[PDB]
Design an enzyme around this catalytic site. Structure first.
Site, PDB file in Angstrom:
ATOM      1  NE  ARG A  36      -3.242  -3.036  -0.124  1.00 31.72           N
ATOM      2  CZ  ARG A  36      -4.227  -3.204  -1.395  1.00 31.72           C
ATOM      3  NH1 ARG A  36      -3.723  -2.622  -2.605  1.00 31.72           N
ATOM      4  NH2 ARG A  36      -4.674  -4.172  -1.005  1.00 31.72           N
ATOM      5  CG  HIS A  95       6.430  -0.059   1.815  1.00 27.16           C
ATOM      6  ND1 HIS A  95       5.807  -0.615   2.959  1.00 27.16           N
ATOM      7  CD2 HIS A  95       5.750   0.851   0.723  1.00 27.16           C
ATOM      8  CE1 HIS A  95       4.744  -0.064   3.195  1.00 27.16           C
ATOM      9  NE2 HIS A  95       4.171   0.566   1.175  1.00 27.16           N
ATOM     10  N   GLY A  96      10.069  -1.559   2.788  1.00 28.87           N
ATOM     11  CA  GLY A  96      11.699  -2.405   2.545  1.00 28.87           C
ATOM     12  C   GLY A  96      11.589  -3.529   3.606  1.00 28.87           C
ATOM     13  CB  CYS A 138       9.158  -3.336   7.477  1.00 30.80           C
ATOM     14  SG  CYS A 138       7.665  -2.394   7.522  1.00 30.80           S
TER      15      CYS A 138
END
Lengths: 149, 90, 90, 149
Positions: A36, A95-96, A138
Protein backbone atom coordinates in the site's frame (compact mmCIF):
# COMPACT_ATOMS: atom_id res chain seq x y z
CA UNK A 1 36.72 15.15 23.47
CA UNK A 2 37.35 15.66 19.77
CA UNK A 3 34.32 17.02 17.89
CA UNK A 4 33.55 17.31 14.17
CA UNK A 5 33.77 20.85 12.82
CA UNK A 6 30.19 22.07 12.33
CA UNK A 7 30.24 25.81 11.62
CA UNK A 8 29.61 26.16 7.88
CA UNK A 9 26.42 27.91 6.73
CA UNK A 10 24.71 25.88 5.43
CA UNK A 11 26.12 22.86 7.30
CA UNK A 12 25.59 20.91 4.11
CA UNK A 13 22.87 19.12 2.15
CA UNK A 14 20.06 17.07 3.67
CA UNK A 15 18.54 14.82 1.03
CA UNK A 16 15.04 13.51 1.62
CA UNK A 17 13.88 10.63 -0.57
CA UNK A 18 10.16 10.42 0.15
CA UNK A 19 8.32 7.49 -1.45
CA UNK A 20 4.54 7.43 -1.20
CA UNK A 21 3.04 6.03 -4.43
CA UNK A 22 3.71 2.31 -4.95
CA UNK A 23 1.33 1.74 -7.87
CA UNK A 24 4.18 0.57 -10.10
CA UNK A 25 5.23 -2.03 -7.53
CA UNK A 26 1.69 -3.40 -7.17
CA UNK A 27 1.53 -3.84 -10.94
CA UNK A 28 5.07 -5.02 -11.71
CA UNK A 29 6.21 -7.13 -8.74
CA UNK A 30 3.98 -10.21 -8.16
CA UNK A 31 4.69 -10.53 -4.44
CA UNK A 32 3.95 -6.82 -4.00
CA UNK A 33 0.44 -7.00 -5.45
CA UNK A 34 -0.96 -5.53 -2.24
CA UNK A 35 1.79 -3.19 -1.03
CA UNK A 36 0.00 0.00 0.00
CA UNK A 37 0.89 3.64 -0.53
CA UNK A 38 2.65 5.22 2.44
CA UNK A 39 -0.02 7.64 3.61
CA UNK A 40 1.27 10.16 6.13
CA UNK A 41 4.85 10.10 4.86
CA UNK A 42 4.63 13.80 4.01
CA UNK A 43 4.35 14.48 7.74
CA UNK A 44 7.82 12.92 8.13
CA UNK A 45 9.28 14.87 5.21
CA UNK A 46 7.88 18.07 6.70
CA UNK A 47 9.27 17.36 10.16
CA UNK A 48 12.72 16.54 8.76
CA UNK A 49 12.64 19.69 6.63
CA UNK A 50 11.73 21.91 9.58
CA UNK A 51 14.16 20.20 11.95
CA UNK A 52 17.22 20.29 9.71
CA UNK A 53 16.60 23.74 8.24
CA UNK A 54 16.52 24.88 11.86
CA UNK A 55 19.89 23.12 12.19
CA UNK A 56 21.17 25.06 9.16
CA UNK A 57 21.07 22.37 6.48
CA UNK A 58 19.94 22.91 2.88
CA UNK A 59 17.00 20.57 2.21
CA UNK A 60 16.78 18.67 -1.08
CA UNK A 61 13.46 16.76 -1.33
CA UNK A 62 12.76 14.07 -3.92
CA UNK A 63 9.34 12.42 -4.02
CA UNK A 64 8.32 8.99 -5.33
CA UNK A 65 11.59 7.56 -6.63
CA UNK A 66 12.18 4.20 -8.30
CA UNK A 67 15.45 2.44 -7.44
CA UNK A 68 17.11 3.68 -10.64
CA UNK A 69 15.96 7.21 -9.80
CA UNK A 70 17.42 6.94 -6.31
CA UNK A 71 20.83 5.89 -7.63
CA UNK A 72 20.75 8.78 -10.09
CA UNK A 73 20.07 11.26 -7.30
CA UNK A 74 22.83 9.86 -5.10
CA UNK A 75 25.28 9.97 -8.01
CA UNK A 76 24.55 13.67 -8.46
CA UNK A 77 25.44 14.35 -4.83
CA UNK A 78 28.41 11.99 -4.90
CA UNK A 79 29.91 14.03 -7.74
CA UNK A 80 28.93 17.37 -6.22
CA UNK A 81 31.50 19.59 -4.51
CA UNK A 82 30.96 19.53 -0.73
CA UNK A 83 34.21 21.40 -0.02
CA UNK A 84 32.35 24.26 1.67
CA UNK A 85 30.13 21.90 3.68
CA UNK A 86 30.86 20.33 7.07
CA UNK A 87 28.31 17.52 6.89
CA UNK A 88 26.01 15.47 4.64
CA UNK A 89 22.66 13.93 5.54
CA UNK A 90 20.44 11.58 3.52
CA UNK A 91 16.96 10.57 4.67
CA UNK A 92 15.13 7.65 3.06
CA UNK A 93 11.39 7.20 3.68
CA UNK A 94 10.00 4.10 1.97
CA UNK A 95 8.99 0.47 2.24
CA UNK A 96 11.74 -2.06 2.80
CA UNK A 97 12.82 -5.60 3.66
CA UNK A 98 15.87 -7.33 5.14
CA UNK A 99 18.85 -5.10 4.38
CA UNK A 100 17.10 -3.19 1.59
CA UNK A 101 14.64 -0.42 0.78
CA UNK A 102 12.13 -0.52 -2.06
CA UNK A 103 11.88 1.95 -4.89
CA UNK A 104 8.36 2.98 -5.86
CA UNK A 105 8.67 0.40 -8.65
CA UNK A 106 9.19 -2.49 -6.25
CA UNK A 107 12.84 -3.00 -7.12
CA UNK A 108 15.29 -3.42 -4.23
CA UNK A 109 18.18 -1.19 -3.22
CA UNK A 110 20.68 -2.65 -0.75
CA UNK A 111 21.34 -0.19 2.09
CA UNK A 112 25.07 -0.70 1.57
CA UNK A 113 24.67 0.33 -2.08
CA UNK A 114 23.27 3.63 -0.88
CA UNK A 115 25.79 4.52 1.82
CA UNK A 116 28.86 3.27 -0.09
CA UNK A 117 28.33 5.97 -2.73
CA UNK A 118 29.70 8.51 -0.25
CA UNK A 119 32.88 6.87 1.03
CA UNK A 120 36.02 9.01 1.15
CA UNK A 121 37.29 7.70 -2.19
CA UNK A 122 33.99 8.12 -4.03
CA UNK A 123 33.27 11.56 -2.56
CA UNK A 124 36.63 13.20 -1.64
CA UNK A 125 35.06 16.57 -0.77
CA UNK A 126 33.35 14.85 2.19
CA UNK A 127 36.46 12.99 3.37
CA UNK A 128 36.84 13.39 7.12
CA UNK A 129 33.34 14.83 7.38
CA UNK A 130 30.30 13.15 8.99
CA UNK A 131 27.94 11.40 6.59
CA UNK A 132 24.59 10.67 8.21
CA UNK A 133 21.88 8.37 6.85
CA UNK A 134 18.42 7.93 8.38
CA UNK A 135 16.44 4.98 7.05
CA UNK A 136 12.72 4.76 7.79
CA UNK A 137 11.47 1.43 6.43
CA UNK A 138 10.70 -2.15 7.47
CA UNK A 139 13.64 -4.56 7.50
CA UNK A 140 11.44 -7.65 7.34
CA UNK A 141 7.86 -8.72 8.02
CA UNK A 142 8.28 -9.93 11.61
CA UNK A 143 6.64 -8.20 14.55
CA UNK A 144 9.21 -7.36 17.24
CA UNK A 145 7.94 -8.97 20.45
CA UNK A 146 7.89 -7.20 23.79
CA UNK A 147 9.29 -8.14 27.20
CA UNK A 148 8.10 -6.98 30.65
CA UNK A 149 10.41 -4.77 32.71
CA UNK B 1 49.75 13.63 5.06
CA UNK B 2 47.57 11.43 7.28
CA UNK B 3 45.20 8.72 6.09
CA UNK B 4 41.99 7.34 7.59
CA UNK B 5 39.66 4.51 6.49
CA UNK B 6 37.60 4.88 3.33
CA UNK B 7 34.43 4.10 5.32
CA UNK B 8 35.12 6.36 8.29
CA UNK B 9 32.78 9.03 9.66
CA UNK B 10 29.46 7.34 8.85
CA UNK B 11 26.35 7.27 11.02
CA UNK B 12 23.50 5.01 9.96
CA UNK B 13 20.25 5.42 11.84
CA UNK B 14 17.90 2.51 11.16
CA UNK B 15 14.26 2.75 12.25
CA UNK B 16 14.42 -0.93 13.19
CA UNK B 17 16.68 -3.91 13.77
CA UNK B 18 16.83 -6.36 10.87
CA UNK B 19 13.97 -8.81 10.16
CA UNK B 20 11.31 -6.57 11.73
CA UNK B 21 8.74 -3.94 10.81
CA UNK B 22 8.78 -0.21 11.53
CA UNK B 23 5.56 1.70 12.17
CA UNK B 24 3.83 4.57 10.42
CA UNK B 25 0.74 6.34 11.76
CA UNK B 26 -0.98 7.84 8.68
CA UNK B 27 -2.15 10.82 10.74
CA UNK B 28 1.05 11.57 12.69
CA UNK B 29 4.06 10.19 10.82
CA UNK B 30 6.39 7.29 11.65
CA UNK B 31 7.41 6.36 15.19
CA UNK B 32 11.11 6.72 14.37
CA UNK B 33 11.22 9.93 12.34
CA UNK B 34 8.78 11.79 14.58
CA UNK B 35 10.76 10.74 17.66
CA UNK B 36 14.05 11.62 15.94
CA UNK B 37 12.97 15.16 15.05
CA UNK B 38 11.47 15.81 18.47
CA UNK B 39 14.70 14.69 20.15
CA UNK B 40 16.89 16.71 17.77
CA UNK B 41 14.82 19.89 18.24
CA UNK B 42 14.89 19.54 22.02
CA UNK B 43 18.47 18.35 22.56
CA UNK B 44 20.66 19.94 19.88
CA UNK B 45 20.18 23.40 21.46
CA UNK B 46 21.53 21.80 24.64
CA UNK B 47 24.72 20.62 22.95
CA UNK B 48 24.01 16.89 23.16
CA UNK B 49 25.76 14.74 20.56
CA UNK B 50 23.92 12.58 18.03
CA UNK B 51 24.75 9.27 19.73
CA UNK B 52 23.19 10.54 22.96
CA UNK B 53 20.14 11.78 21.05
CA UNK B 54 19.74 8.51 19.16
CA UNK B 55 19.95 6.66 22.48
CA UNK B 56 17.00 8.73 23.67
CA UNK B 57 15.16 7.88 20.45
CA UNK B 58 15.77 4.20 21.20
CA UNK B 59 14.27 4.75 24.66
CA UNK B 60 11.22 6.64 23.41
CA UNK B 61 10.39 4.29 20.53
CA UNK B 62 10.90 1.28 22.80
CA UNK B 63 8.03 2.56 24.96
CA UNK B 64 5.53 2.68 22.11
CA UNK B 65 3.40 -0.27 21.11
CA UNK B 66 1.07 -1.68 18.50
CA UNK B 67 -1.89 -3.12 20.42
CA UNK B 68 -3.43 -4.88 17.42
CA UNK B 69 -0.41 -7.20 17.24
CA UNK B 70 1.28 -6.62 20.61
CA UNK B 71 4.16 -5.37 18.51
CA UNK B 72 7.14 -3.22 19.42
CA UNK B 73 9.85 -1.37 17.49
CA UNK B 74 13.57 -1.24 18.20
CA UNK B 75 15.60 1.45 16.35
CA UNK B 76 19.26 0.71 15.72
CA UNK B 77 22.19 3.03 14.99
CA UNK B 78 25.50 1.86 13.50
CA UNK B 79 28.54 4.11 13.19
CA UNK B 80 32.15 4.62 12.17
CA UNK B 81 32.22 8.17 13.55
CA UNK B 82 35.66 9.05 14.96
CA UNK B 83 34.60 12.17 16.86
CA UNK B 84 31.59 13.55 18.74
CA UNK B 85 28.88 14.78 16.36
CA UNK B 86 26.83 17.82 17.32
CA UNK B 87 24.57 20.10 15.28
CA UNK B 88 24.97 23.57 16.85
CA UNK B 89 21.97 25.91 16.64
CA UNK B 90 24.03 29.09 16.32
CA UNK C 1 3.72 -3.44 33.81
CA UNK C 2 5.77 -1.83 31.03
CA UNK C 3 7.15 -3.61 27.97
CA UNK C 4 10.21 -2.91 25.83
CA UNK C 5 11.54 -4.59 22.65
CA UNK C 6 12.90 -8.13 22.82
CA UNK C 7 16.16 -6.93 21.23
CA UNK C 8 16.66 -3.81 23.34
CA UNK C 9 19.78 -2.94 25.33
CA UNK C 10 22.38 -4.52 23.04
CA UNK C 11 25.78 -3.12 22.13
CA UNK C 12 27.75 -4.86 19.40
CA UNK C 13 31.34 -3.76 18.96
CA UNK C 14 32.76 -5.04 15.68
CA UNK C 15 36.50 -4.80 15.04
CA UNK C 16 35.72 -3.95 11.42
CA UNK C 17 33.02 -2.96 8.96
CA UNK C 18 31.70 -5.82 6.83
CA UNK C 19 33.71 -7.22 3.88
CA UNK C 20 37.08 -6.24 5.37
CA UNK C 21 39.92 -7.64 7.45
CA UNK C 22 40.88 -6.83 11.03
CA UNK C 23 44.52 -6.87 12.15
CA UNK C 24 46.44 -8.89 14.72
CA UNK C 25 50.06 -8.24 15.67
CA UNK C 26 51.37 -11.58 17.01
CA UNK C 27 53.60 -9.75 19.50
CA UNK C 28 51.15 -7.11 20.75
CA UNK C 29 47.58 -8.29 20.21
CA UNK C 30 44.88 -7.04 17.81
CA UNK C 31 44.47 -3.38 16.85
CA UNK C 32 40.86 -3.33 18.06
CA UNK C 33 41.04 -5.19 21.37
CA UNK C 34 44.26 -3.51 22.48
CA UNK C 35 42.80 -0.09 21.64
CA UNK C 36 39.51 -0.99 23.34
CA UNK C 37 41.15 -2.00 26.63
CA UNK C 38 43.46 1.01 26.66
CA UNK C 39 40.49 3.34 26.14
CA UNK C 40 38.36 1.57 28.76
CA UNK C 41 41.15 1.65 31.37
CA UNK C 42 41.81 5.34 30.75
CA UNK C 43 38.26 6.64 30.32
CA UNK C 44 35.97 4.58 32.55
CA UNK C 45 37.54 6.11 35.69
CA UNK C 46 36.58 9.46 34.17
CA UNK C 47 32.92 8.50 33.84
CA UNK C 48 32.80 8.44 30.04
CA UNK C 49 30.08 6.25 28.53
CA UNK C 50 30.80 3.31 26.22
CA UNK C 51 29.63 5.05 23.05
CA UNK C 52 32.09 7.88 23.70
CA UNK C 53 34.86 5.37 24.40
CA UNK C 54 34.09 3.34 21.28
CA UNK C 55 34.18 6.57 19.27
CA UNK C 56 37.72 7.12 20.55
CA UNK C 57 38.58 3.54 19.58
CA UNK C 58 37.32 4.30 16.07
CA UNK C 59 39.61 7.35 16.01
CA UNK C 60 42.67 5.49 17.29
CA UNK C 61 42.31 2.43 15.05
CA UNK C 62 41.63 4.68 12.05
CA UNK C 63 45.11 6.16 12.51
CA UNK C 64 46.90 2.82 12.32
CA UNK C 65 48.04 1.28 9.07
CA UNK C 66 49.37 -1.83 7.40
CA UNK C 67 52.27 -0.67 5.21
CA UNK C 68 52.69 -3.99 3.40
CA UNK C 69 49.26 -3.54 1.81
CA UNK C 70 48.51 0.13 2.47
CA UNK C 71 45.60 -1.23 4.48
CA UNK C 72 43.46 0.40 7.14
CA UNK C 73 40.89 -0.81 9.66
CA UNK C 74 37.53 0.73 10.54
CA UNK C 75 35.82 -0.54 13.73
CA UNK C 76 32.04 -0.34 13.85
CA UNK C 77 29.63 -0.32 16.80
CA UNK C 78 25.89 -1.06 16.49
CA UNK C 79 23.45 -0.60 19.36
CA UNK C 80 19.91 -0.76 20.70
CA UNK C 81 20.95 0.70 24.07
CA UNK C 82 18.19 2.88 25.55
CA UNK C 83 20.31 4.58 28.21
CA UNK C 84 23.89 5.76 28.76
CA UNK C 85 26.23 2.87 29.57
CA UNK C 86 29.08 3.42 32.01
CA UNK C 87 31.30 0.99 33.90
CA UNK C 88 32.04 2.71 37.25
CA UNK C 89 35.37 1.89 38.90
CA UNK C 90 34.07 2.14 42.46
CA UNK D 1 20.39 11.57 31.05
CA UNK D 2 19.12 8.13 31.97
CA UNK D 3 21.90 5.66 32.79
CA UNK D 4 21.90 1.87 33.20
CA UNK D 5 22.19 0.70 36.80
CA UNK D 6 25.77 -0.55 37.26
CA UNK D 7 26.42 -1.12 40.96
CA UNK D 8 26.29 -4.90 41.47
CA UNK D 9 29.48 -6.69 42.57
CA UNK D 10 30.36 -8.40 40.34
CA UNK D 11 28.74 -6.35 37.55
CA UNK D 12 28.12 -9.63 35.79
CA UNK D 13 29.88 -12.21 33.62
CA UNK D 14 32.40 -11.42 30.90
CA UNK D 15 32.77 -14.40 28.59
CA UNK D 16 35.92 -14.66 26.51
CA UNK D 17 35.90 -17.14 23.63
CA UNK D 18 39.54 -17.28 22.58
CA UNK D 19 40.29 -19.34 19.46
CA UNK D 20 43.91 -19.96 18.56
CA UNK D 21 44.33 -23.48 17.13
CA UNK D 22 42.74 -23.95 13.70
CA UNK D 23 44.25 -27.34 12.87
CA UNK D 24 40.79 -28.91 12.51
CA UNK D 25 39.76 -26.24 10.00
CA UNK D 26 42.88 -26.73 7.88
CA UNK D 27 42.13 -30.45 7.72
CA UNK D 28 38.33 -30.42 7.39
CA UNK D 29 37.41 -27.34 5.34
CA UNK D 30 38.95 -27.37 1.82
CA UNK D 31 39.00 -23.59 1.37
CA UNK D 32 40.65 -23.22 4.79
CA UNK D 33 43.63 -25.44 3.97
CA UNK D 34 45.98 -22.59 4.85
CA UNK D 35 44.15 -20.72 7.62
CA UNK D 36 46.80 -20.03 10.26
CA UNK D 37 46.67 -20.25 14.04
CA UNK D 38 45.99 -16.91 15.72
CA UNK D 39 49.33 -16.30 17.41
CA UNK D 40 49.22 -13.49 19.95
CA UNK D 41 45.53 -13.92 20.75
CA UNK D 42 46.40 -14.69 24.38
CA UNK D 43 47.61 -11.10 24.68
CA UNK D 44 44.05 -9.98 23.88
CA UNK D 45 42.48 -12.43 26.33
CA UNK D 46 44.85 -11.20 29.02
CA UNK D 47 44.11 -7.54 28.35
CA UNK D 48 40.35 -8.15 28.41
CA UNK D 49 40.68 -10.15 31.62
CA UNK D 50 42.68 -7.41 33.35
CA UNK D 51 40.49 -4.61 32.03
CA UNK D 52 37.12 -6.10 32.95
CA UNK D 53 38.18 -7.57 36.29
CA UNK D 54 39.29 -4.03 37.10
CA UNK D 55 35.77 -2.99 36.09
CA UNK D 56 34.34 -5.59 38.49
CA UNK D 57 33.24 -8.31 36.05
CA UNK D 58 33.68 -12.05 36.62
CA UNK D 59 35.79 -13.43 33.76
CA UNK D 60 34.86 -16.74 32.12
CA UNK D 61 37.53 -17.79 29.58
CA UNK D 62 37.03 -20.55 27.01
CA UNK D 63 39.88 -21.47 24.67
CA UNK D 64 39.79 -23.08 21.22
CA UNK D 65 36.09 -23.64 20.63
CA UNK D 66 34.40 -25.23 17.62
CA UNK D 67 31.08 -23.71 16.54
CA UNK D 68 29.10 -26.41 18.35
CA UNK D 69 31.17 -25.75 21.47
CA UNK D 70 30.47 -22.02 21.26
CA UNK D 71 26.71 -22.56 21.06
CA UNK D 72 26.91 -24.90 24.06
CA UNK D 73 28.72 -22.26 26.11
CA UNK D 74 26.25 -19.54 25.16
CA UNK D 75 23.33 -21.81 26.02
CA UNK D 76 24.76 -22.31 29.51
CA UNK D 77 24.85 -18.55 30.07
CA UNK D 78 21.47 -18.02 28.42
CA UNK D 79 19.91 -20.39 30.95
CA UNK D 80 21.93 -19.04 33.87
CA UNK D 81 20.35 -16.72 36.45
CA UNK D 82 21.66 -13.16 35.98
CA UNK D 83 19.16 -11.68 38.44
CA UNK D 84 21.93 -10.37 40.70
CA UNK D 85 23.94 -8.99 37.76
CA UNK D 86 23.61 -5.57 36.12
CA UNK D 87 25.36 -6.40 32.86
CA UNK D 88 26.59 -9.17 30.54
CA UNK D 89 29.63 -9.10 28.25
CA UNK D 90 30.77 -11.64 25.65
CA UNK D 91 34.09 -11.34 23.82
CA UNK D 92 34.82 -13.40 20.71
CA UNK D 93 38.41 -13.66 19.43
CA UNK D 94 38.66 -15.73 16.25
CA UNK D 95 38.85 -15.80 12.47
CA UNK D 96 35.78 -14.70 10.55
CA UNK D 97 34.14 -13.72 7.28
CA UNK D 98 31.16 -11.64 6.13
CA UNK D 99 28.68 -11.64 9.00
CA UNK D 100 30.17 -14.70 10.70
CA UNK D 101 32.96 -15.96 12.94
CA UNK D 102 34.72 -19.31 12.52
CA UNK D 103 34.91 -22.04 15.10
CA UNK D 104 38.28 -23.76 15.42
CA UNK D 105 36.80 -26.48 13.19
CA UNK D 106 36.17 -24.10 10.31
CA UNK D 107 32.39 -24.14 10.65
CA UNK D 108 30.60 -20.78 10.54
CA UNK D 109 28.57 -19.08 13.26
CA UNK D 110 26.39 -16.15 12.18
CA UNK D 111 26.94 -13.16 14.49
CA UNK D 112 23.16 -12.84 14.84
CA UNK D 113 22.99 -16.45 16.04
CA UNK D 114 25.33 -15.51 18.86
CA UNK D 115 23.71 -12.28 20.05
CA UNK D 116 20.11 -13.49 19.65
CA UNK D 117 20.66 -16.09 22.37
CA UNK D 118 20.46 -13.29 24.95
CA UNK D 119 17.35 -11.38 23.93
CA UNK D 120 14.87 -10.49 26.68
CA UNK D 121 12.66 -13.49 25.94
CA UNK D 122 15.48 -16.01 25.78
CA UNK D 123 17.26 -14.65 28.86
CA UNK D 124 14.64 -12.95 31.11
CA UNK D 125 17.09 -12.35 33.98
CA UNK D 126 18.95 -9.91 31.70
CA UNK D 127 15.83 -8.11 30.47
CA UNK D 128 16.37 -4.36 30.65
CA UNK D 129 20.08 -4.86 31.28
CA UNK D 130 22.93 -4.03 28.87
CA UNK D 131 24.26 -6.96 26.84
CA UNK D 132 27.63 -6.16 25.29
CA UNK D 133 29.38 -8.16 22.57
CA UNK D 134 32.90 -7.47 21.28
CA UNK D 135 33.82 -9.30 18.08
CA UNK D 136 37.47 -9.43 17.01
CA UNK D 137 37.61 -11.13 13.61
CA UNK D 138 37.75 -10.39 9.88
CA UNK D 139 34.42 -9.76 8.16
CA UNK D 140 35.77 -10.51 4.70
CA UNK D 141 39.08 -10.69 2.83
CA UNK D 142 39.17 -7.14 1.46
CA UNK D 143 41.76 -4.59 2.57
CA UNK D 144 40.08 -1.37 3.72
CA UNK D 145 41.61 1.42 1.63
CA UNK D 146 42.78 4.71 3.07
CA UNK D 147 41.97 8.32 2.19
CA UNK D 148 44.10 11.44 2.80
CA UNK D 149 42.85 14.04 5.28
Amino acid sequence: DKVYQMKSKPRGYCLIINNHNFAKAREKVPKLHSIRDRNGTHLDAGALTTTFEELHFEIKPHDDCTVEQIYEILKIYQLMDHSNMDCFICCILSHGDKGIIYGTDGQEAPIYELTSQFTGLKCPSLAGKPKVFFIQACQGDNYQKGIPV
Amino acid sequence: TRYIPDEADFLLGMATVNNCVSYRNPAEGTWYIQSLCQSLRERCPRGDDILTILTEVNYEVSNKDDKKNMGKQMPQPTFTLRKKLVFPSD
